[PDB]
Structures are given as C-alpha cells and as structure tokens.
Design a protein around this nucleic acid. Structure first.
Ligand code: MG
Ligand code: MG
Ligand code: MG
Ligand code: MG
Ligand code: MG
Ligand code: MG
Ligand code: MG
Ligand code: MG
Ligand code: MG
Ligand code: MG
Length: 51
RNA sequence: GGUUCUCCCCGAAAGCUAUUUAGGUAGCGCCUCGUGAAUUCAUCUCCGGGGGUAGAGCACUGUUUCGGCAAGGGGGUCAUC
C-alpha cells in the first residue's frame, strides 16, 4: 500500500520516482519503445513464412 | 501541484551509448530481493608484464641566441666587348 506515510517506505511518491512518465497518471511508453529509435523488432528484417 | 498508519533490513544515481534527442526515454553502469556456484573476489608480500606520462634531453621534427669558419647574396668603387 503505497503513499500512506513516511514509515511505509513508499509514501509521497508511490514508488514511481520523481516526475517521470512513470509518475504521471496514465503515463508510460508503449511496448518496444526505445527512446525514439526504431526498435530492434524493426531494425532487423523479416524472414520466412507460415505453412 | 498533491499523494493519507507504524516498525525493521539493505540502500542509489545525476555516468556511458542513442534518440525531431538535450527538464523525456531505452540498454548498460550503480541499488534491492530471490536462486545457484568455485581457496570466486578484495587487500598485502613476492614474481612476470607492456608503458612513454611527469621529469629530462635537443640526435630527429621544429624553433632560438652567441661565437668561429664561410660559400653565396646585396650595396659601393673601378671596368661594364
Ligand atoms: Mg524509501
Ligand atoms: Mg521519476
Ligand atoms: Mg513531485
Ligand atoms: Mg546502512
Ligand atoms: Mg531520428
Ligand atoms: Mg537527458
Ligand atoms: Mg529531473
Ligand atoms: Mg521535456
Ligand atoms: Mg612528450
Ligand atoms: Mg612533459
């Protein structure tokens, strides 16, 4: 139970750190986001087919 | 901007790389928890290594002063077939 006082050890920030995307309500990047670069599953080429 | 009860144990970072990136983020570095593993790791002594820094030096690359020797160059006087 985060954000329930100093003694709990998870108060006033809820374990989210300080003013990042993870600290915003509904914040955070999608799966595979690499900071702006095209992710590895897009740097690498497709191969093969499904039989 | 704010995030509400208590105690105990451990305990950071403000670095690297990349980004329409530079008050964001991802991986790594650093933290915690769990599970494994070796006289694994750290320190010292001794031994075996590659350095080319500090310093020094002026053979080399350059730079710099004085003296000696001295072509050569410039100026003047004659001659300038
Ligand atoms: Mg805490
Ligand atoms: Mg944060
Ligand atoms: Mg805040
Ligand atoms: Mg402590
Ligand atoms: Mg780009
Ligand atoms: Mg930044
Ligand atoms: Mg900040
Ligand atoms: Mg920003
Ligand atoms: Mg040197
Ligand atoms: Mg030196």
């Amino acid at each position: 139970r985060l954000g329930r006082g100093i003694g709990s050890g998870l108060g006033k920030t809820g374990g989210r750190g300080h003013k990042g995307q993870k600290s915003r309500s509904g914040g955070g990047v999608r799966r595979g986001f690499e900071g702006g670069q095209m992710p590895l599953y897009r740097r690498l080429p497709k191969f093969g087919f499904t039989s």
